[PDB]
Symmetry: D2
Subunit: 211 residues, 4 copies
């Protein structure tokens, strides 16, 4: 039935990504922000179902902002949690992603040059938004999205990094560069490799965990 999303459990404990991301941020980010996207998405979807059945197009259009924002919220965060992992896990080793890192090096020259390019895009975001490594056709691209806009246009998301201030401010204050530098330690390259090899639908299977 429509609008039965729930907050999925994290793949790890709230303090599992320290020192890169504090337990305080993880708990707030998950239990509060992600939770709010779930609740407000469900409310919008139930309202939309009525308007859709009634062929009430004005109400449907007026509901789009709530669905894109909160729906994008659960999409982006579902992907986000899955492509993070504890620094001690083997999945944080980029050796877990031989084909992806091979294509990264082909495209940007090296993994370090890619990290530099990605960092620049993340720090260049004006306001709230996300940075993404995506697969487009066979090639890789760095893209950013504003607010909670998701990567649903056709590309395969490989991994994303949240640049909303609530993702880092309590720990890094205005130092978003330090946040980005440290998040590399907790990137889940096993997840990234799997998405790189799969297609768009494969990548979004994770959303089933929220239903």
């Amino acid at each position: 039935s429509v609008g039965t999303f729930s907050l999925p459990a994290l793949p790890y404990a709230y303090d599992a990504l320290e020192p890169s991301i504090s337990a305080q941020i993880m708990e707030l980010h998950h239990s509060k922000h992600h939770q709010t996207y779930v609740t407000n998405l469900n409310n919008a979807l139930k309202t939309y179902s009525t308007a859709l059945a009634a062929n009430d197009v004005p109400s449907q259009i007026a509901l789009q902002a709530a669905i894109k924002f909160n729906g994008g919220g659960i999409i982006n965060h579902s992907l986000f949690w899955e492509n993070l992992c504890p620094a001690s896990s083997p999945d944080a080793d980029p050796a877990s992603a031989p084909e992806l890192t091979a294509e990264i090096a082909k495209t940007w020259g090296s993994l370090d040059k890619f990290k530099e390019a990605m960092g620049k895009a993340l720090l260049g975001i004006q306001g709230s938004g996300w940075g993404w490594l995506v697969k487009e056709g066979s090639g890789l691209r760095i893209v950013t999205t504003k607010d909670q806009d998701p990567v649903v246009g056709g590309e395969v998301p490989v991994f994303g990094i949240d640049m909303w201030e609530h993702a880092y401010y309590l720990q890094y204050l205005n130092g978003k560069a330090a946040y980005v530098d440290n998040i590399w330690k907790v990137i889940n390259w096993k997840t990234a490799e799997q998405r790189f090899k799969g297609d768009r639908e494969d990548a979004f299977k994770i959303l089933k965990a929220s239903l």
Copy 2:
């Protein structure tokens, strides 16, 4: 059932607004452009229903552009045809709208100053879009919208003027100023008065004619 919109008949013949708007434009604008919005809206709505029932949020967000564009298309054109009428009709006489014209004069000083102000907004639109007289709270405002974006945010639409090039180009070429000057002759002030007296829901009842 979902997606059963049809093209409503015009309140007048295709040549009824000459010389202000040619019969060629009216026929193309109605039988082709408005028709296409109807057909593509219905298809998008049915596809959305599938995604909504499946809680497929990525597909829903990807469909929003088609629903807003084609849904706004049928909304704006339904309102547009209704607030046009033959120049010889009494409804084109602004005396048909005593309360609205009184509020216009209170707001812009006179009807002539409003029309001049409105023209400036219409001619200032970059690309495709619409100009609207709307009621917000108790006051009147001139607003513009891009492409087929409709006035569904809460304001009451009073009347709109289509500034897409297909609304005038065959007859006026690049002379959109002449188009605007001549469309005043075929504005349906009876409709404008009715919407001014009603609320938001009242104004959109015209959409029932497309179902």
Copy 3:
């Protein structure tokens, strides 16, 4: 010469707005965020000077986002600091704004009902942005802007409230409703009255303090 903006001093100490806004936030918000908008604006403006002299239109257009973002940043924050004051100051008393509060009560019914309307708009902002009371013509309107977009389209800014997460997160966490509730306590109604009685250029004279 082009691009000689500097960070203006606050009208009060960093801890002067406590308990509504913490000294930590004020210092970070002013010395870091506002400072960065100043620095990046000056550099963008100088780069623009090069492009204008060269009639390099591609470069000019590519620079617009940096000028709007950082230029809006210094505009919005200059206005922001000026329309805040200590809760103990007489200027925080809305009695300091007889004409404005009369028009507010005229417009929304009462000051409390206006505060309710404003709060809803502020809390409805998706992502980063600002809420503004503005004077348009003779009437008052609540408007929101995204990111650092400023109110430069013609309205007279009366007062603004920053809803970027860096404006409240350290103190209120995700509780933006509590932030809004408490910021009313430090609104400078003397400033608001002055802007309300003046025109657009009058309101932006404050920018001279940054030159």
Copy 4:
């Protein structure tokens, strides 16, 4: 000096692209639309120079829409005329672009599949806009822009196709699919090859013809 742009002559007579594009459209498109962008750009730039020298940021931001719209107008149309040519010219033969067509086949599989992809993108534009083949890094990409937004973000424009209704409506009416089918005959693949082989600066040197 600032704001001394002029309308460059076409590389051919107004009727040289028939039957693909009528002489009536070419004359209106060039002598009227492109001319207006030139005039309104010059006026915006002269006003901007004053605001820039005065560090008047509000005025600079308020002028951005006019500079982007009219500046993009002259950029896009300058490139547009240059990448069109008579259907009988050898430059209209894709054999004139061996390196480009080779990369196209690598990217989309074949020239026909690229044309199919481009056509879909062009016909999918909502409202006014442009479709572009661009070079990003070493790869080719199809992108669309709204209104007169130009491709100034870093990519090298290879060729563009105007999808504003004034580019085809007088001749094709609502039949934009027929317009796209026929414009392939007058694409200047010699020009496209040169841009593909050059860098971004190389591509925009054509603007010098407007000074």
